[model samples]
Target chain A: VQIVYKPVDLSKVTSKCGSLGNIHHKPGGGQVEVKSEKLDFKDRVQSKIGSLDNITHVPGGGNKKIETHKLTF
Target chain B: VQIVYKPVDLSKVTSKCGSLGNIHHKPGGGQVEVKSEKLDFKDRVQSKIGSLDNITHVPGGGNKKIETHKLTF
Candidate 1:
């Protein structure tokens, strides 16, 4: 019933979502997955709920870091 | 013949293109205009060329500045 969402930073493997889970980096980069059961949004929406997945990268060429937030209705 | 291009920053009046010309500021903001004669691509091209006019602005709510560059073919 809970919708699990795994939003990954395609630019890099490391994640900024410290609360959701850890990002496992491969040779190049990695991804972080999030399950909605932890978010407690188990069966309530027929509409579009927005989530904030922000990735702040250093200016002028550097690795990117990500932060993910869960949204529910 | 020489192609005279005046590239203006609609965002702000100040320019980032150093050595090209000066940016005259008005009450609100100003712009810098560049003439292509100094670029020296006056009369030898049958196609389009490119130029670098980069503007760097600070983050987190402040006034925007601009830079201009001239291109030739």
Candidate 2:
């Protein structure tokens, strides 16, 4: 269990989103998965933009806490 | 297959590193995995800090192309 602050760039690899949130791996391995609401939210936003490219109106009073997760595998 | 720039924060979830790089899931699912060298490198550095905790000097001429990857599940 370790914590650090950093930026995660996933622009090079192919990926998708699903619901296997409860998976774990053995220690000292090369693959790991962490939960990140920041990426998840961005994914949803991008999907919406692609599927529905109209509507430029953001809702009023949209301030909330932000989070990010890095899953290396 | 989509591309975007974003930040990943894995501060809240429990995760570990292993070698499952060639795994994939069906499209449009809730769980997704992406390969990110950024996180991978950070993980290595952190592990070294914990295990060794000594070394005030970084490698010389450490300028190279940086990358980040986000894996959402």
Candidate 3:
């Protein structure tokens, strides 16, 4: 059992193609994959993003308060 | 720093009251809370939620692939 994780911010993502499953990241960014939901999307490539200290160096003193989670790998 | 954190699921939230500041958990959940933007929301009052090994003890075969994160307390 080897585990460690972190990742967040699904604020209206929007990938598209999937009323069943192929790529359904659409929230507020809209949903459009076409052709019986072809689903071909990409763009937000996070090459590296883990320690921005939760949005730029902790909101301030004792890390003020911010909890966003959904990571498992 | 005691440092330890976990929390996620901004998946079309909905708290309201905020376009520039003060609460904005609104997404596919609709946006309402008037009076120059009211924003009175509550419900997900977690007492503690961490280490479920990322969803139902993992999908299978050494955890499938799930990553969602945010936490600073």
Candidate 4:
């Protein structure tokens, strides 16, 4: 199935990658959608991503939270 | 290096997976952070993901756009 994840909040987020702190986006920022097929490494990608809306950290950030959205494609 | 990507906009997006339209997340609902190690499939994953904040379409969305944030790990 297809999915578009929108992170309504990112203040509680921390990252080892300093680039994250540079984020200064409008409310429309933090949108990620995925279109999966039975081809390529899509399913494999999904397997590593877990749930699109359940990521605990950013590419290189802290790792402690519950029921969060991690927009990985 | 670690990275965190935010989409800033998603209205111009479309997906074949159909689930893209079911998004009703709070502002903080679309957060995806990654803690990559020079291990596992991290770099390999990065290669497939392209750039974190430069994804045109979602996982199963249309493939036409310019300089978009994909938020992939």
Task: Provide the overall lDDT of each model, using Cα atoms, as 2-decimal numbers.
Answer: 0.26, 0.27, 0.25, 0.34
Q: What digit string (tens of lDDT, one per residue) describes model 1 on residues B1-73?
A: 4343333222222222112212221222223322232222233323222221223222122222322232324
Residue-wise C-alpha lDDT for candidate 2, range B1-73, written one tens digit per residue: 4434345533322222232233222222122243323222222131211010111211112122333455653
CAPRI class of candidate 3: incorrect
> How do these models rank on TM-score, best leading?
1, 4, 3, 2
TM-score of chain B of 2: 0.17
**Model 3 lDDT at residue B62:** 20
Q: Score chain A of each prediction against the true chain A by TM-score and list the results.
A: 0.19, 0.18, 0.14, 0.17
TM-score of each: 0.15, 0.13, 0.15, 0.15
Q: Write the per-residue lDDT of candidate 3 for residues B1-73, one digit (tens) a residue.
A: 2343333456432222112212222223222221222222244322211111111111111211244343333
Q: Candidate 1 or 2, higher lDDT?
A: 2
* Candidate 1: C-alpha lDDT: 0.26
- When 1 and 3 are scored with lDDT, the better candidate is 1
Best candidate per lDDT, number? 4
Candidate 1 has what TM-score?
0.15
List, residue by residue over A25-52, the lDDT tens digit for candidate 3.
2224222221121222234322211111
Compared with the true structure, the alpha-carbon lDDT of candidate 2 equals 0.27
Error of 2 at A17 (Å): 35
Lowest lDDT 10-mer window, candidate 2 chain B?
B48-57
Residue runs of model 1 more than 4 Å from their true location after superposition = A12-68, B1-73
